[PDB]
Chains A and B, each alone.
With several copies, the nearest count.
Chain A
Amino acid sequence: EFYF
């Protein structure tokens, strides 16, 4: 959820 911290990478896009």
Chain B
Amino acid sequence: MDPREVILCKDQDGKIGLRLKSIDNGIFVQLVQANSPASLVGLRFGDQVLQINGENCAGWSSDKAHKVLKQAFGEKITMTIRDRPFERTITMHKDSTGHVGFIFKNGKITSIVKDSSAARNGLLTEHNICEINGQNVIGLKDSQIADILSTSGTVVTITIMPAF
């Protein structure tokens, strides 16, 4: 899957609304602030940052990545992104009680309920939910995600990735 190029423009505090995290000697988006330079260019939780301003991110720590952003010179920051490489999609169907079949806490799937659609479809635990029927749920309270599910209809398509 080919990477893509984005050019961000800093806000007033020299920030772009982005938190990053080192995973397996790569750099990944950990949080994207709403209505930020990062959201303007379509960054999402789980996107991989391959390069910043012409430097490869391979092997950088979280602290280094944050420092490079904070210190970035001028008002424009260039990045090359591999769109969330660990993403998978699972489609489930609600049962007669309105459930798809998993336990959820602090943004993580923690258990799979027996005899459910989640079980039939091989949903995994220690995974975060990124989207529900296309809607970002990263950073939402568990109760807000419950709200969303209540109005999603019988078909529930989620994007997930390992929590790492």
Which residues of A line the B interface, CB within 8 A? 1-4
Contacts and interface: CB of A to CB of B under 8 A. Distances in A.
Secondary structure at chain A's binding surface: helix, strand, loop or mixed? loop
Secondary structure at chain B's binding surface: helix, strand, loop or mixed? mixed
B25 interface: no
Nearest to A1: B105
A3 B104 CA distance: 6
Contacts, number: 41
Interface in B59-87: 66, 69-70
A1 B20 CA distance: 13
Contacts of B93: none
A4 B16 contact: yes
B15 interface: yes
Contacts of A4: 15-16, 18-20, 66, 69-70, 99-104, 145-146, 149
B23 interface: no
A-B CB proximity, top 7 nearest: A1-B105, A4-B69, A4-B66, A2-B104, A1-B103, A4-B149, A2-B146
